[PDB]
Amino acid sequence: VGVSGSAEGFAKGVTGGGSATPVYPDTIDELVSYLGDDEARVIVLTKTFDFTDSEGTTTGTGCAPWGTASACQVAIDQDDWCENYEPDAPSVSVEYYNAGTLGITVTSNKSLIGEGSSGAIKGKGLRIVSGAENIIIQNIAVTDINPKYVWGGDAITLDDCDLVWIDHVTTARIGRQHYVLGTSADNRVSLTNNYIDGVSDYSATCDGYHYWAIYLDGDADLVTMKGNYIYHTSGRSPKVQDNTLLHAVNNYWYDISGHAFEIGEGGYVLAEGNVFQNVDTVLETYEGEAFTVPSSTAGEVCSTYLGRDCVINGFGSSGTFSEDSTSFLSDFEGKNIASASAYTSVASRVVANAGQGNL
Template identity: 40%
Template sequence: MKIAALASLFLAATAHAQVQGTPFGFAAGTTGGGAAKPAAPSSLQELVSWLTDDVPRTILIDREWNFVGTEGTTTGKCCSTKTTTCEGGTSKGQAWIQDKCDDGTWITCKWDNAARKAIDIGSNKSIVGVGDKGVLKGKGLRLTNGNKNVIIQNIHFTQLNPEYVWGGDALTLTDTDQVWVDHNKFSLIGRQHIVSGWKPAGHVTISNNEFDGRTQWSAGCNGKHYWTMLLIGEKDYYTFAGNWVHDVSGRAPHMGTTKTNSENFFHGVNNYFQNIGGHSFDVDANTWMLLEGNVWEGVDTPITDTTLKSGAVIYNVPNTKAGRDCAGSIGQDCEINQLTKSGAFAPRTDADVLKKAALYKASIAPHTPVADIPKNVMANAGVGKI
């Protein structure tokens, strides 16, 4: 092939590897690296340098970057409980990396250090996988210290000490704002796929991601990951749209807390929750949640009983009338939700949700028909699909 033709192919591939689409919902206006020229790092050291500096960048993840073993290992004590031994379970359990073991026994364990310390991301970054090649193995990312305006797209996060609870979090958001998490995949994570800390996560859109809980180390002893998402920031506003959450067993997601004077508004629209051998939503007070056009299929507990008594404010569009009643507040009808081969989801149409949603009318994303969701989400969620 001639040099000119090779150059043309390279330029085409590079152009395609830039951010695809436009942030919507609460993350609308997020620009990430903006017009920064896309570039792929040549080493782990350069990757970390680019991720952490204060230069606007579009960073291409064009291969598997493997952090496993790069920071050594630790042999220490882990707490073993009934969720570790898993008598009668269908998978191995997870031991706990922690300082106390009041309800179990100490065992010797060995973990990889890299997964336990995330990379702190600088402001104004677009971190974009190329095709289906972009993998961060054994390392998570964290947005904190006021850094903001970040796009994370088309990357597979995997292998963060999946044997251990507290083995590592894939993505942490605390003391940040304007974050778009789009078309990524999360698998084999020790603790949370996504977690917000006590400080604000700000305005966040989590869209078209695959949360894959299949594992041989499970706190539920059922081959399904428990610690999916923990969203408890002080001021958090989420658009959660088009995601495929499957084969998990809990915190899918957990939201809200009474430990701080928090405000957590969550718009969950057109997501597909599938094969959840435990609970999906677990919601505490200080949370306003609008759920529309979602599908739960094969989900034991779509929402926990404690949620319905916690003080959380919920509008789950149980019928077409409830859908029409949205229009006066947000300028559009809401789409009903659908449950198939799943537990019950008690109808909730708390008016305060629509009052709160009216304040954020411009950030309420549109929906598509619920009947199309399983097919659409399976076709679009995850890496290599942009």
């Protein structure tokens, strides 16, 4: 088996391991060596690669800023987080697996794919290290990484890498972030057809909604979000900061008891053809700029920059997000722009195609 389809949007042209002969790791040590070696590879996962106990367990002390009920999340005191960034109240005993703490290193030219609904990584995430480029991660699940502890683990981390395509990936029951982007100026990333499963037994809101979803904290990066299914989260869906240009097209947000967008100072968002269903608050913080195509006529302004009109979003039992800032539209010129379907087909097509196993 190999990579199915190709990247749309900013990372169009990504090849990953290309035509390299597929290798089928057998043990977790082999998987780790294949992702970090200096050679083009197509790596296939046919079973769940469990890393939960691989690096032991630590007993330490953290705080409980979001209640002390069973269904609440508590924080691990990394860098004296508690006492520093939030002079906490109850300090509790925490016991976590050391593997979830840091993700597996991923170097350049890799295609990591899963076969059917079999490929998965448990107890540890992935980290696309600085300088790495041309990486395809498709059809796998990254789950169970210290569910009850913040700082307990991040599922997928990108830090200063270019031409990365994450497609049909499912993430669930992670301690902290499902996606954290620390990309640099002009780094192209396409996140397509992914399934962010925010349903967890422990949440920083204690209701079973994951707060730490998607964090775009890059420098001057270009991110395309298309066909993603964001479900049962309570915040950071997504949190955009610095000077990130985000093209969010044809995504589906459903059952968000909390909020979706947090647009920090400097962040640019072009949101078109998305569906927001049962999202309490679509826009929380707004210090940056956004064009949400308030009407089809307003969308006509996109023609000179994207080669076509922008399309409206659909809102069903959700808060509003109606902004028409167009200052940043010329930043689209000469780049690979993902196409947009009417929002009318989005809810159905996303639930049918998003996530591991629906390739």
